[PDB]
């Protein structure tokens, strides 16, 4: 119930030690759909009603590719979730068989806005991407979160194209 | 060795219908490696020497992921490939645990471009990621080739972001 997703070894150390006082930040566990994960996550956009039983079957699929899909929490000195982030490793045949990360699904509850928990999600993940062995992450934001990608060190490299059905 | 990557009842029939005489559209399978395969990529960016070893390897990992990963070819009526294109379906917990397709490094060799393959690569991926029941499909594009985008029904949603190791 409480087993991290992935090993807490893949938790930038130097974001460790830089985060607020009595704040965490730690792989996603099972037990953390008690924690108000999906309530963050609404920040983002919308997530729809979820049982136990549903989060339950998706968080074991995730489980399973462990090296494929990374969730990290960010908890408040309650161990409250208050921030979320994802990384997925996507494995290609350019660039030597070469894998590029996938930062995802970004999200800091309103009232902990602010306060560099997105920009220490955003290191975390890189730290992952890095470590694994990817050439590089990526992620499509708006314009009117593009300035807090580039106080997190990402440069503008193309456009997001979508076709919704 | 010749057995498809995923399931041939997954390409559009609609697409199938309309691809230009003898011209075939189908997964990848991993005799492919001697058909050309690498050499279409390698329009779009570097790809390196892969050795065919390295090729089975990569291979057999997608296709264990075959739920997941959805590369497909279109084939000249020689059976040589010339273009390429994937479809990495991402699992969420947002959108009532929905699905994003993402569409990926496609490619047509240049002497087969501007005869609408690179359409149909996208119409394919298209159908594979609303069939199998993403919400929507997205990619990243430059704004040179943008308009191919726009051609092929996708529209402008935002901003890509990178950061290179
Ligand atoms: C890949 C994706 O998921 S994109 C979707 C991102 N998520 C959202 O937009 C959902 C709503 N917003 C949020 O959840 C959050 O505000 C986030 C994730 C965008 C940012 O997290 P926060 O914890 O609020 O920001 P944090 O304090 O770490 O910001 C770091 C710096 O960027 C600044 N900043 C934050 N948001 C923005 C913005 N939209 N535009 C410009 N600057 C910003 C901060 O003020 C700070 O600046 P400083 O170094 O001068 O202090
Ligand atoms: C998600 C990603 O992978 S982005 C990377 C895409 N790949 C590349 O840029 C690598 C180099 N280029 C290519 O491989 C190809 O030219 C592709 C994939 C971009 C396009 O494939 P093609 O087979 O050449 O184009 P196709 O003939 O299907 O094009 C459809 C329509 O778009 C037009 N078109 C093609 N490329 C462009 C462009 N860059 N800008 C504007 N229009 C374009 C065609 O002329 C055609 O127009 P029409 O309906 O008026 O005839
Ligand atoms: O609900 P959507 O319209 O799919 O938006 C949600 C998406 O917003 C994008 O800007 C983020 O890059 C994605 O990580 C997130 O999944
Ligand atoms: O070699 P890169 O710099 O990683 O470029 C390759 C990438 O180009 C982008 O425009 C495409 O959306 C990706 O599908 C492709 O993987």
């Not at 309530?39 to 462990?66: F, H, K, M, P």
Request: charge should be negative.
């Amino acid at each position: 119930e409480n087993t991290p997703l992935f090993s807490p070894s893949l938790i930038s150390p130097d974001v460790l030690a830089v985060l607020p006082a009595d704040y965490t930040i730690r792989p996603l566990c099972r037990s953390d759909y008690k924690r108000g994960y999906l309530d963050v996550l609404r920040v983002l956009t919308t997530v729809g009603d979820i049982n136990e039983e549903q989060w339950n079957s998706r968080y074991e699929w995730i489980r399973a590719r462990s090296d494929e899909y990374y969730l990290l929490v960010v908890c408040d000195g309650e161990g409250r979730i208050v921030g979320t982030g994802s990384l997925v490793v996507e494995r290609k045949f350019i660039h030597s068989l070469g894998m590029v990360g996938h930062i995802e699904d970004i999200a800091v509850e309103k009232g902990q806005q602010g306060k560099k928990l997105g920009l220490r999600i955003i290191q975390a993940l890189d730290y992952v991407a890095e470590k694994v062995g990817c050439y590089k992450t990526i992620l499509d934001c708006s314009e009117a979160n593009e300035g807090f990608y580039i106080k997190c060190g990402f440069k503008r490299a193309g456009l997001e194209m979508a076709h919704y059905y």
